[PDB]
């Protein structure tokens, strides 16, 4: 089954240490593409590359473009809550 969990991080005026990827297509997923070495996200060990962000501070990203996710993140506040879905067994198909 799909694994969805939520994490609340306190950035204290600092960054989360998370780099996300996506596009402006309303329904493309917002993916954690990399983590800053030594950053908060990495130090918690609770954020992983490849997982997708479903909501930020309770604001759903369903049908929202990357620009909205970036906006939600820089307008978050001292604490940021991320609803995350674990990546699955996706393998490239050749034809």
Curated annotation (Swiss-Prot):
Domain PDZ: 6-88
Organ and tissue specificity: Expressed in brain, testis and retina. In brain highly expressed in the olfactory bulb, cortex and hippocampus and lower level in thalamus, cerebellum and spinal cord. In brain it is found in the perikaryon, dendrites, dendritic shafts, dendritic spines and, excitatory and inhibitory synapses of neurons. In retina, it is most abundant in the plexiform layers than in perikarya.
Compartments where located: Cytoplasmic vesicle; Perikaryon; Cell projection, Dendrite; Cytoplasm
Transmembrane stretches, start-end: none
Domain notes: PDZ 6 mediates interaction with the PDZ recognition motif of EFNB1 and EPHB2 and with the C-terminus of PPFIA1 and PPFIA4. PDZ 4 and PDZ 5 mediate interaction with PRLHR. PDZ 4 and PDZ 5 mediate interaction with the C-terminus of GRIA2 and GRIA3. PDZ 4, PDZ 5 and PDZ 6 mediate homomultimers. PDZ 7 mediates interaction with PDZ domain of GRASP1. PDZ 7 domain binds CSPG4. PDZ 6 mediates interaction with the C-terminus of liprins-alpha. PDZ 1, PDZ 2 and PDZ 3 mediate interaction with the PDZ-binding motif of FRAS1.
Subunit: Interacts with EFNB1, EPHA7, EPHB2, EFNB3, KIF5A, KIF5C, KIF5B and the C-terminal tail of PRLHR. Forms a ternary complex with GRIA2 and CSPG4. Can form homomultimers or heteromultimers with GRIP2. Interacts with GRIA2, GRIA3, GRIPAP1/GRASP1, PPFIA1, PPFIA4, FRAS1, PLCD4, PTPRF and liprins-alpha. Interacts with ATAD1 in an ATP-dependent manner. ATAD1-catalyzed ATP hydrolysis disrupts binding to ATAD1 and to GRIA2 and leads to AMPAR complex disassembly. Interacts with SLC30A9. Interacts with BUD23.
Function: May play a role as a localized scaffold for the assembly of a multiprotein signaling complex and as mediator of the trafficking of its binding partners at specific subcellular location in neurons. Through complex formation with NSG1, GRIA2 and STX12 controls the intracellular fate of AMPAR and the endosomal sorting of the GRIA2 subunit toward recycling and membrane targeting.
Entry protein name: Glutamate receptor-interacting protein 1
Provenance organism: Rattus norvegicus (Rat)
Native organism taxonomy: Eukaryota, Metazoa, Chordata, Craniata, Vertebrata
């Amino acid at each position: 089954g799909a694994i969805i969990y939520t994490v609340e991080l306190k950035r204290y005026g600092g960054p989360l240490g998370i780099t996300i990827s996506g596009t402006e297509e309303p329904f493309d997923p917002i993916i954690i593409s990399s983590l800053t070495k030594g950053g908060l996200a990495e130090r918690t060990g609770a954020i992983h590359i490849g997982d997708r962000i479903l909501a930020i501070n309770s604001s759903s990203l369903k049908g929202k473009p990357l620009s909205e996710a970036i906006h939600l993140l820089q307008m978050a506040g001292e604490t940021v809550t991320l609803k995350i879905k674990k990546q699955t067994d996706a393998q490239p198909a050749s034809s």
